[PDB]
Design a protein around this ligand. Sequence first.
Ligand SMILES: CCCCCCCCCCCCCCCC(=O)O
Ligand SMILES: CCCCCCCCCCCCCCCC(=O)O
Lengths: 210, 273, 256, 256, 178, 238, 55, 55
Amino acid sequence: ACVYFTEYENSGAKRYAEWVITPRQAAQLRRKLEFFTYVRFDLELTFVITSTQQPSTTQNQDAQILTHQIMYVPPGGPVPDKVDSYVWQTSTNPSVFWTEGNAPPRMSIPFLSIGNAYSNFYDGWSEFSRNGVYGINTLNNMGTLYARHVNAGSTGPIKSTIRIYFKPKHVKAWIPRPPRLCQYEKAKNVNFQPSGVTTTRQSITTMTNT
Amino acid sequence: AAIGRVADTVGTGPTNSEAIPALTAAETGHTSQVVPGDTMQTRHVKNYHSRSESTIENFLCRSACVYFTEYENSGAKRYAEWVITPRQAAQLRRKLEFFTYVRFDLELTFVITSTQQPSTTQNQDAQILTHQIMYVPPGGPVPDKVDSYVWQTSTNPSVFWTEGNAPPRMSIPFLSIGNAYSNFYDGWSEFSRNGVYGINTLNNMGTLYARHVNAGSTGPIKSTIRIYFKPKHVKAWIPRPPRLCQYEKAKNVNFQPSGVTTTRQSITTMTNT
Amino acid sequence: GYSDRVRSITLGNSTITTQECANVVVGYGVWPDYLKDSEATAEDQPTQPDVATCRFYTLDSVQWQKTSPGWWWKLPDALSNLGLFGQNMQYHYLGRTGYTVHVQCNASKFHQGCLLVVCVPEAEMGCATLDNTPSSVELLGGDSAKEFADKPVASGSNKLVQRVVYNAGMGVGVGNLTIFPHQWINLRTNNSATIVMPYTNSVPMDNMFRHNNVTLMVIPFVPLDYCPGSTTYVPITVTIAPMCAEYNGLRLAGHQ
Amino acid sequence: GYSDRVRSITLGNSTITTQECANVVVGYGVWPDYLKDSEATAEDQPTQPDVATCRFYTLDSVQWQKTSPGWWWKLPDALSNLGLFGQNMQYHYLGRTGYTVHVQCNASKFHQGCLLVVCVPEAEMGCATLDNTPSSVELLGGDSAKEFADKPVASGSNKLVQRVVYNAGMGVGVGNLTIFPHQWINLRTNNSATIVMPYTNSVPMDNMFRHNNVTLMVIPFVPLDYCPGSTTYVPITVTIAPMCAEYNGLRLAGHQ
Amino acid sequence: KVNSMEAYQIPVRSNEGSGTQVFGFPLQPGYSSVFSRTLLGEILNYYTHWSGSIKLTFMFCGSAMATGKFLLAYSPPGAGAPTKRVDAMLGTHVVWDVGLQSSCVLCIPWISQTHYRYVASDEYTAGGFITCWYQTNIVVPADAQSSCYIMCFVSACNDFSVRLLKDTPFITQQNFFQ
Amino acid sequence: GLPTMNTPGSCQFLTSDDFQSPSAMPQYDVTPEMRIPGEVKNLMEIAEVDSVVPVQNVGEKVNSMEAYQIPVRSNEGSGTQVFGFPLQPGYSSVFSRTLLGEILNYYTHWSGSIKLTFMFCGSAMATGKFLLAYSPPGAGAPTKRVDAMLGTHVVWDVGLQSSCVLCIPWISQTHYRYVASDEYTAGGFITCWYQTNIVVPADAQSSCYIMCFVSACNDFSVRLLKDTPFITQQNFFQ
Amino acid sequence: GAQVSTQKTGIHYTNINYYKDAASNSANRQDFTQDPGKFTEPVKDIMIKSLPALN
Amino acid sequence: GAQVSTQKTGIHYTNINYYKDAASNSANRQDFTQDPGKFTEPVKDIMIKSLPALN
Ligand SMILES: CCCCCCCCCCCCCCCC(=O)O
Ligand SMILES: CCCCCCCCCCCCCCCC(=O)O
């Protein structure tokens, strides 16, 4: 399930992408996972990386094959401040190197929770004073993902989109709950806009959906 | 327990003897072996935590870019060259330097990428690029130009790669002349205690050379070659304090005096300030 | 009637005694021993002087002053001019040893301080000027301690040593020197420090002049202090004894 | 390698150490223990907090001055506001405990003095004015010592305590306090005092506010003394740990 | 002081009272500047999660004639750091009495709601506060220094482990070294 | 279709790879083998065979048989050095082009003892004794006979047995030494001296020559295969 | 001749070396040996925890 | 050592794990366990269908 996607460009202002890892920015997968209170599973990661030539006035453009680099930075690790920061050395951080044309890069991820199961809901706070953060986001500390090109390729400008897909494997779920009714509003909390229980119909005798 | 499991917590109760687990004498040079139960009533805990990710092997076994240069389609620098060393990158170097001597095989991986250079050449139509990396052990003929006879490699080992394909990769045995790679060497290269000093008197790992095999297009192209190291089958001896001061030079341990740690208000401040 | 505070060590025609030591630290658990035939390369018959070379050599004392930053001695080197141990170094291309390092320093129930005796294997040192490497004369003190500095050492195209104590001249936390065989002389309870070091190196044997595999360092973490009346000159003496010393590749003398 | 001078006590999430104690006095030979079923009356399921209530609570220190007459603490009381032990007292009609009482006080080979640590069970106290009985506020000091007086206390329709030390405020010879579980902290050889007290009373359990079955007293028989130069502030700290604490008759809190 | 041996010294001296705090730092073996550059801390900083008890060994470097007792304590999170001795003794503690045995250990038991804690900072993963107090003030004789120092050593217990390998923030560069 | 997944290295072309590949001549019948004298199995078989060393590189002599001649003659004293070259079987011009040296130059590391056989080509009537010596590194090359005899040596006495051997024992701090030059890998100095000057009778030439052969011992080995510096070209030969 | 080991968990996997050099084999990620003694406790005389370190 | 299970139908398939971590294994798509009781029927006193729920 595509849970998110951003873009980074050949050159210019945003030359590298960054994303605080989360399954709550997409609504599809998030509503399923939220079918249960606590969950435990391994995760199959798949990346769909595509590039598109940007409109410019550069003469004779002759792009070379693009090679990207996705890198994961666990909470507490040095972050890249520029596409050529020393951080992309990844002596220890795990990262994939991919080249356009090849099959989507993919890799497995163990159940990374600090607890005995991922929590989908958390009716609590981050502070013992019941201040600070509230809700699911006080538990989310899955680190950040960073993408970038390794080569610029052509003289012309190119924009690349990176789609992140999640696929739970070896699943165990506990305490089912009512499926989400109200549309999602924010990514870091359950805030909603009050919704009716269902679509309507004429009278309690109408055999039609109206 | 389970080969790599961690010790379980032994349940304890009230004490009142003359047994003194808590009192010791650091002067001995001995580290205390106290455990929770020794200074407080504990419950029993079957601990399943493993130390699997702390093995010397798992700690040093991840590809690390140790260096990278570039060479161009045409012009002045048409071929690259690099005296092999793990000390130009700081990441991997600081880990390896966690131990005095080390021994391991090495998994080499190369990430080769090209970029079209800005020029005024009309109708450019690049053909697929094919590179050649070549290793020259200390004592062997070196290339002086991108078309030197040396790139024949009748005996020198070298890889030929073509853009688009997976990164080229190959294994390298423990190449030391000694019984283990040395990370530090408090000595000289001369018996008079002159000449070179430090780790670099032992580094004689030869040179690596890259180049294109074809020019590809009429236009100018620049290629970058990233070298990655990945220690395999590791054995390490005599751990040492981790590097504190930033690295300054690649061929010695020279540093710029640094404070022991970041500061904070007073010895009572529970905050990092 | 037995106390681990008391101890006595005999090596050759020399014996040492203490009535207030801690334990005795033994290398990395390993006890010195000659080179096994399945671990050698030098094909010639080695020489084992034994009693003549593996004895207690007492170096120059040193004064511990309320402000002393610390000292250090390169080991193969600190003895290169003492007795036959030195004569064997000069005459042979190859040598191999371990040592019983004994650091003495008595005070009184009224003084205070805490030294850190440590054997650092392969103690490569940094330079004050980032473009050079310390000179032999600046690193080696042979039987006479080398002092650490209370504060940084300035650059300026010299071949000096970045002797700043809290960096042990290696660019690391001085307080992490404990991962090396060590003991602490805490005048309050202690009085001496003993460490037996097994031969360490990435090779069976090495040239004893060209290389210094171990470096002994004494570094006060808690400065000496007393009161008007208590004596002021509290020296620190170092005695080192080679163990299972072997030498190969005999030739003409000279450390050239 | 064993010395009765050294000792260590663990109770709950707390441990205590001494390197210069005497023995350890154990109550009237009896060691604390919960109430047996053939010795109880309260029919309800008691509560045994255990680790939460039977831990080491360190009270307010106190200064031993060359003239200090002594101190005292009513026991069920001295902890009535410390942690969950106190919370249980407030919430329950009935309680039952024993304690490991540890009195600390270090000096130096150059000071001198001798304290008398004693656990007096049922220490009813007298009044300065023969027609009244001391008030709660005058007897209880809860976690803060109560001082004895160097000389008599005058009458005059007040509800004060006849704190004259040599009478222990009980009208008896202070020097006969030894028939009670005790130890002597004689700075010369001692350094701390440990006493384990079993539950004492004429009934299985009692209300912990309304009654104070034991009273800890520290009383110098040989006054502190040193010399110009030696430190002057020599504190005395008291740590007490409940043992096998049980509570019955749960109800609303408050010590009303 | 971070630029001298003094960084490793804990000031202790004779006072005109007891109860005085001697020091206090949090249980953040990975983050807190106090631990972060330690042998333990250096290692933790190459990982994301940690778990286990920790040992804090305290060596008294006063003079043979100096005496005194200290209260080493560990208060799990939930409330604030204890501000008075009488509030710290309500938590996991060890009353250390200085004597022939120079050092004393405060074993910080791994109490936590989760199996592992983050090496980085995070309040969910809060670890509590480690503080020291005067149990019975320092007491020297004449001609013996009344101001002393106490060293503090740290190390992991046999139930300590680390997970999720990552890069250290402690080492950086701008260009390949020459 | 068996689910597969290519890994790094895929499609590359390592010069030293080792894989199977289809024959372009399916079922071709190879010519039957034949017993040919002197087969070779390992290069060390060759490195164990003596070859004449050119100790006299001196100037123009490299272009004549003289390069292989060691001058010896009657003197008015003893102690005189006769020659002296380093132990650099790979680098030193003295060895580099030898049978042993040629082989070493296709490798990066070497280890083992070496044999220097010295044949006296004087006349039957000529006599004398020489001091063949090997001084391990650490000090300098011995400059006087009295300083060379302090090292590993053989006092050779010329007589009916024409040749004499100086076995240079592999003394070294590392298991292997670099074939190329490097001071860490220093090998020491090989020198010869007059023990008791040449002594001929009348009518017998007083100036003679001594040849020097070199070969590897049974404990000699070589590692890390590389290209020789000794062969070059500018264009494919026609 | 393949080999069969255990994977990491809280099942097995098959391995067949394809190269003539051991250097080519995958990493040895499962060596869980441990010997702290060399570092913590390199004392010549065994120190018994419950006892006094000096007497 | 491979394994051999049954495919889904109205035959078997072979599987050989190639990685050292169980996390790398394919999904467990064939666990057909079922226990509705936890949810439908979490009553302390067993309710017999044919009987009255209250009396
Ligand atoms: C290149 C390596 C990439 C590694 C990808 C790591 C992604 C971590 C995924 C965490 C999963 C879903 C968790 C929700 C967290 C929470 O709210 O507690
Ligand atoms: C195409 C063939 C490439 C071969 C790559 C060979 C690289 C050699 C690596 C040596 C490794 C790390 C050694 C540090 C050396 C030292 O300081 O002693």
